[PDB]
Amino acid sequence: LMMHSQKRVVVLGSGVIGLSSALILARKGYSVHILARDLPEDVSSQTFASPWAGANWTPFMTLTDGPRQAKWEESTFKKWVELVPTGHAMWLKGTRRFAQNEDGLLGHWYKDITPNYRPLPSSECPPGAIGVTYDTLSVHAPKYCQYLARELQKLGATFERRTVTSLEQAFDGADLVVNATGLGAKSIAGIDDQAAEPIRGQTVLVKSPCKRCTMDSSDPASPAYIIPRPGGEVICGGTYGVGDWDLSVNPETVQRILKHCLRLDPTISSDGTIEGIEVLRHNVGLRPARRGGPRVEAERIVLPLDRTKSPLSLGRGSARAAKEKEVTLVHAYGFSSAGYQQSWGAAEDVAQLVDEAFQRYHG
Amino acid sequence: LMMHSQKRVVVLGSGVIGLSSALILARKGYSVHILARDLPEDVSSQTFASPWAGANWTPFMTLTDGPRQAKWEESTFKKWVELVPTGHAMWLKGTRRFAQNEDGLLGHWYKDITPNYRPLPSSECPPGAIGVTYDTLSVHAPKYCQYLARELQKLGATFERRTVTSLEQAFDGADLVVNATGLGAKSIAGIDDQAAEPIRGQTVLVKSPCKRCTMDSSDPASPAYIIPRPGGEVICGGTYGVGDWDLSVNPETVQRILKHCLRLDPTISSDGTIEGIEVLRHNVGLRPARRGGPRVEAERIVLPLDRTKSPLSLGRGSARAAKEKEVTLVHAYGFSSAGYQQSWGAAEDVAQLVDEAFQRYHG
Ligand SMILES: Cc1cc2nc3c(=O)[nH]c(=O)nc-3n(C[C@H](O)[C@H](O)[C@H](O)COP(=O)(O)OP(=O)(O)OC[C@H]3O[C@@H](n4cnc5c(N)ncnc54)[C@H](O)[C@@H]3O)c2cc1C
Ligand SMILES: Cc1cc2nc3c(=O)[nH]c(=O)nc-3n(C[C@H](O)[C@H](O)[C@H](O)COP(=O)(O)OP(=O)(O)OC[C@H]3O[C@@H](n4cnc5c(N)ncnc54)[C@H](O)[C@@H]3O)c2cc1C
Ligand SMILES: N[C@@H](C(=O)O)C(F)(F)F
Ligand SMILES: N[C@@H](C(=O)O)C(F)(F)F
């Protein structure tokens, strides 16, 4: 006859978004169980995006285009600042950002967040490009996720490897589920989001003491970036293949990335030559994006599903009846190229949604 | 001071081809270690093709177009016949095969292998299509792989989960490696096969006592097949998306597959209606194909790799020196839509190549 928790929540997905959401909920005293196919220890799995990130803080939208994104990025920057003393985040001082034009600098909205923000002289920019410099932050993407999982462990959250094909499979043991499935949201019956799309990103992981970050979007024919991460390594990018699911390494892309990154910063090489670059690994990850932007909202759903709710519902197309329950589904997916830099703010919004739903529907 | 084996081989890949190759080699007394990312217990992993097969025996080429394929298929049919008494293979009696024309029947080359081979009357074919009927065989693809793994266990083979990015990582503990990596062959340094390509196959797994197999290639706008497998289930297909990496479920494709399969055989439904079909799961697998056909051959390779051998070689582009060794690489990949039905014959050819290489290079 023990007093049992009335705050059970299932988090579906264990990428940086499911982990961050799960952690703030655990901190709020929720009993959290994480169901996912890919776990933080799967550091080379291509069926989720989180092991492949830079991961740095680089706003990609204006305030008007992405009000939520900016909110989430500002909050996450504050969190990452707090992680520098223990090494879970690292300063990228004198980061260099190049754009094709003034508009590509996004209204400079974040100039109060990144220290020492200032324009760069044309002499310090690629020919014909415009640029700014600032201090931003980066995390070691797989290790950051493992860090969050450790924090979750201490708060009593649990993990389970599972691959869901229909919503009722996630509503096992909880009347509220956080859906942080990335690309998976499209093929789970009861979610069926056709708007989910991948954005392919190929990179080269390099061994280098280079501590300078350079983000170059001034050449529309060649996206390029150099992101140092904790550990004496730098990630050289990159690609943005919208709707591209190809998980194979493109050898031509390798050449373009290294050549371009070498232009940007020869110190990524031992001798300033492409042949002098110490390659550690060739990577391809699929960013989980979504037409219409990231989805962060709570939905009320009736179980069991019927073929009317989902074309992918299981069992016979003709269905009703017994049993029948209403549950809460809190979406958190489609962060595209900004899942890490938005993760803490997004998790905050998710946790507020869960609190609200609990008040309105779960007692 | 024990007498140690001089027949150590590494098998890279644990799909039906790596497993079959490994088993015949183990039977020949080789000491076999299987290195792979995906193992037979990973029955819903989309990063290899073997969990998603029908898997039945359906020749796809003429003798002239695919002499190896036919050889491999004929040998595998014999093996599967031997597995019927213990249930690891099942007869698909009165299988129905529809084609657009006489040429689509491939010269009837296999009519001596499949019992009761005979043409079908136009009345028993889709309008305007031509057809034949015969008894063929099917295996339960993931359970068949688990069966092979059990056989391997008894013969002393071992398994290890590993994801290789460069050949020297596979030549650990053996001077000969069998490369059965499917699509992976394209991105492993030292193999770098740009010809490897996926062929996307979406299917619907259905609960049904239907024991009749129907293969319909008469409608070029709608590939369709119904493959019963051991266990009271049938796999309804399908798609052949050449070069398509999309792992998401296409809801429209679902409708087309079920409608077409229902035309072909209403008993896949409880009431002969689409709504009467008991859906178990929606699946998407990537067939590992290869332009130029499957690759089954032995290659002599010098380690360590240099950037001249592979654009993806690790370390600095400028490389030589110490150490330096020659090893044997036996390729076995690119079986496309016929990996199961060709697996035993292919494994036979692989094992002969290994025997030959051992004679010529490993003592
Ligand atoms: C090359 C590259 C560079 C990047 N660099 C940056 C960067 O510097 N800064 C930044 O902010 N972002 C960066 N990103 C983007 C960031 O990787 C992604 O936004 C973020 O990882 C998305 O996290 P997620 O949790 O939403 O999804 P994912 O990490 O994809 O996790 C989805 C989770 O859901 C699980 N799941 C999916 N379907 C199912 C199912 N059916 N049942 C059970 N579980 C399921 C998966 O297994 C996994 O646990 C980069 C990404 C790449 C590819
Ligand atoms: C829908 C569908 C229907 C089919 N039906 C039939 C059928 O009825 N009859 C038939 O004969 N065939 C059928 N097939 C085709 C059959 O699935 C494939 O030909 C067969 O599975 C190929 O086996 P494989 O061993 O070559 O490759 P895979 O099964 O893809 O295994 C490749 C292995 O290599 C590992 N690997 C890859 N890269 C690396 C790396 N870098 N390091 C470590 N390991 C690595 C993988 O993890 C895995 O272990 C179908 C396939 C599908 C998708
Ligand atoms: N966010 C990273 C991306 O996903 O590639 C970028 F900073 F490099 F842009
Ligand atoms: N071999 C199967 C395929 O890969 O889809 C088929 F028989 F259905 F064709």
Side-chain angles (χ1 to χ4, degrees):
Chain A
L1 219 356
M2 289 174 40
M3 170 183 88
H4 304 287
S5 170
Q6 276 154 16
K7 294 169 60 167
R8 280 181 118 69
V9 160
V10 162
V11 173
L12 182 61
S14 188
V16 68
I17 296 298
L19 290 164
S20 303
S21 307
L23 182 53
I24 291 175
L25 289 171
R27 288 178 170 196
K28 291 175 152 275
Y30 286 94
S31 178
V32 177
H33 189 236
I34 299 154
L35 282 172
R37 175 188 49 226
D38 305 277
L39 293 176
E41 57 261 43
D42 307 335
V43 301
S44 62
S45 164
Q46 289 180 295
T47 48
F48 66 142
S50 284
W52 310 111
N56 72 174
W57 198 91
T58 310
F60 300 120
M61 295 167 103
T62 62
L63 292 181
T64 298
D65 282 345
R68 288 176 308 157
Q69 286 89 340
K71 183 184 73 183
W72 296 336
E73 280 157 7
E74 187 158 18
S75 167
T76 305
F77 197 94
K78 272 164 198 156
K79 171 78 177 157
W80 285 6
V81 164
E82 302 176 5
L83 296 178
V84 168
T86 47
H88 292 286
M90 143 187 104
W91 283 106
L92 295 174
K93 306 196 165 142
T95 285
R96 283 121 28 115
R97 177 176 201 165
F98 304 133
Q100 311 174 52
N101 56 48
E102 183 62 15
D103 273 357
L105 292 179
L106 309 179
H108 306 92
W109 77 259
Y110 53 93
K111 66 182 149 326
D112 292 342
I113 297 159
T114 52
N116 299 309
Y117 189 100
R118 76 197 178 231
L120 285 167
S122 344
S123 71
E124 288 169 49
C125 301
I130 185 163
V132 296
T133 183
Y134 52 82
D135 307 338
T136 188
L137 293 155
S138 72
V139 301
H140 189 300
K143 282 183 200 285
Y144 180 80
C145 290
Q146 287 164 4
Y147 159 71
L148 298 179
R150 288 194 297 278
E151 298 305 303
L152 277 155
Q153 280 191 270
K154 298 184 270 189
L155 294 175
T158 46
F159 293 81
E160 182 191 334
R161 212 184 271 284
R162 189 185 298 178
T163 295
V164 166
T165 57
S166 189
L167 268 193
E168 74 279 353
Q169 296 156 197
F171 284 100
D172 69 339
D175 293 317
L176 188 146
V177 166
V178 173
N179 164 220
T181 54
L183 294 171
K186 168 166 172 193
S187 298
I188 293 159
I191 312 179
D192 301 282
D193 192 349
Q194 305 303 300
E197 63 179 5
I199 308 182
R200 187 183 170 277
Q202 177 172 332
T203 66
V204 186
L205 173 72
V206 166
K207 183 63 162 160
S208 175
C210 174
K211 288 241 102 121
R212 183 166 68 207
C213 174
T214 306
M215 315 294 297
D216 185 5
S217 60
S218 69
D219 185 355
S222 183
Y225 52 79
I226 302 164
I227 298 168
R229 70 183 187 175
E233 302 173 339
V234 303
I235 289 169
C236 302
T239 63
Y240 298 91
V242 177
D244 191 349
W245 287 82
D246 184 1
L247 292 175
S248 74
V249 175
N250 188 145
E252 303 176 83
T253 293
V254 172
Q255 322 310 323
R256 175 185 70 69
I257 285 168
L258 296 185
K259 275 175 225 170
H260 192 155
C261 285
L262 188 77
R263 293 203 280 295
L264 298 179
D265 192 344
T267 68
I268 61 177
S269 166
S270 67
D271 50 15
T273 78
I274 285 336
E275 289 74 23
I277 297 159
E278 178 161 355
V279 179
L280 290 184
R281 192 180 202 282
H282 292 285
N283 322 289
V284 182
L286 303 183
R287 308 166 180 88
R290 177 181 176 264
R291 296 186 293 285
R295 189 177 189 195
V296 174
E297 68 196 6
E299 159 177 40
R300 283 296 277 179
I301 279 149
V302 166
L303 292 183
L305 302 179
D306 64 357
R307 190 63 46 71
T308 77
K309 211 282 203 253
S310 167
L312 308 185
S313 61
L314 307 177
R316 310 201 169 71
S318 26
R320 276 150 229 253
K323 223 113 208 214
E324 257 248 335
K325 82 189 144 165
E326 198 147 11
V327 294
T328 303
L329 187 56
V330 186
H331 300 291
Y333 65 92
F335 294 90
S336 189
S337 56
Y340 276 81
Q341 65 192 43
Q342 285 165 18
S343 54
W344 197 255
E348 290 178 319
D349 277 8
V350 169
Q352 150 68 18
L353 288 169
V354 172
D355 279 348
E356 190 76 33
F358 256 77
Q359 287 303 116
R360 296 195 201 180
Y361 314 109
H362 307 269
Chain B
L1 219 356
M2 289 174 40
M3 170 183 88
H4 304 287
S5 170
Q6 276 154 16
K7 294 169 60 167
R8 280 181 118 69
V9 160
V10 162
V11 173
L12 182 61
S14 188
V16 68
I17 296 298
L19 290 164
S20 303
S21 307
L23 182 53
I24 291 175
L25 289 171
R27 288 178 170 196
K28 291 175 152 275
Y30 286 94
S31 178
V32 177
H33 189 236
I34 299 154
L35 282 172
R37 175 188 49 226
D38 305 277
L39 293 176
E41 57 261 43
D42 307 335
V43 301
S44 62
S45 164
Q46 289 180 295
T47 48
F48 66 142
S50 284
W52 310 111
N56 72 174
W57 198 91
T58 310
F60 300 120
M61 295 167 103
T62 62
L63 292 181
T64 298
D65 282 345
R68 288 176 308 157
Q69 286 89 340
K71 183 184 73 183
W72 296 336
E73 280 157 7
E74 187 158 18
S75 167
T76 305
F77 197 94
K78 272 164 198 156
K79 171 78 177 157
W80 285 6
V81 164
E82 302 176 5
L83 296 178
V84 168
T86 47
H88 292 286
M90 143 187 104
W91 283 106
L92 295 174
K93 306 196 165 142
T95 285
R96 283 121 28 115
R97 177 176 201 165
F98 304 133
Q100 311 174 52
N101 56 48
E102 183 62 15
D103 273 357
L105 292 179
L106 309 179
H108 306 92
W109 77 259
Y110 53 93
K111 66 182 149 326
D112 292 342
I113 297 159
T114 52
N116 299 309
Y117 189 100
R118 76 197 178 231
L120 285 167
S122 344
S123 71
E124 288 169 49
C125 301
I130 185 163
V132 296
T133 183
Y134 52 82
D135 307 338
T136 188
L137 293 155
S138 72
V139 301
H140 189 300
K143 282 183 200 285
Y144 180 80
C145 290
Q146 287 164 4
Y147 159 71
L148 298 179
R150 288 194 297 278
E151 298 305 303
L152 277 155
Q153 280 191 270
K154 298 184 270 189
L155 294 175
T158 46
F159 293 81
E160 182 191 334
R161 212 184 271 284
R162 189 185 298 178
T163 295
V164 166
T165 57
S166 189
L167 268 193
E168 74 279 353
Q169 296 156 197
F171 284 100
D172 69 339
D175 293 317
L176 188 146
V177 166
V178 173
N179 164 220
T181 54
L183 294 171
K186 168 166 172 193
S187 298
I188 293 159
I191 312 179
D192 301 282
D193 192 349
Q194 305 303 300
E197 63 179 5
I199 308 182
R200 187 183 170 277
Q202 177 172 332
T203 66
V204 186
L205 173 72
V206 166
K207 183 63 162 160
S208 175
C210 174
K211 288 241 102 121
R212 183 166 68 207
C213 174
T214 306
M215 315 294 297
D216 185 5
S217 60
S218 69
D219 185 355
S222 183
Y225 52 79
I226 302 164
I227 298 168
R229 70 183 187 175
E233 302 173 339
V234 303
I235 289 169
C236 302
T239 63
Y240 298 91
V242 177
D244 191 349
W245 287 82
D246 184 1
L247 292 175
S248 74
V249 175
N250 188 145
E252 303 176 83
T253 293
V254 172
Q255 322 310 323
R256 175 185 70 69
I257 285 168
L258 296 185
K259 275 175 225 170
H260 192 155
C261 285
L262 188 77
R263 293 203 280 295
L264 298 179
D265 192 344
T267 68
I268 61 177
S269 166
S270 67
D271 50 15
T273 78
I274 285 336
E275 289 74 23
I277 297 159
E278 178 161 355
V279 179
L280 290 184
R281 192 180 202 282
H282 292 285
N283 322 289
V284 182
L286 303 183
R287 308 166 180 88
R290 177 181 176 264
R291 296 186 293 285
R295 189 177 189 195
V296 174
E297 68 196 6
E299 159 177 40
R300 283 296 277 179
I301 279 149
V302 166
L303 292 183
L305 302 179
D306 64 357
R307 190 63 46 71
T308 77
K309 211 282 203 253
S310 167
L312 308 185
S313 61
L314 307 177
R316 310 201 169 71
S318 26
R320 276 150 229 253
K323 223 113 208 214
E324 257 248 335
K325 82 189 144 165
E326 198 147 11
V327 294
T328 303
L329 187 56
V330 186
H331 300 291
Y333 65 92
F335 294 90
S336 189
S337 56
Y340 276 81
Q341 65 192 43
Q342 285 165 18
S343 54
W344 197 255
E348 290 178 319
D349 277 8
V350 169
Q352 150 68 18
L353 288 169
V354 172
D355 279 348
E356 190 76 33
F358 256 77
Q359 287 303 116
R360 296 195 201 180
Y361 314 109
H362 307 269

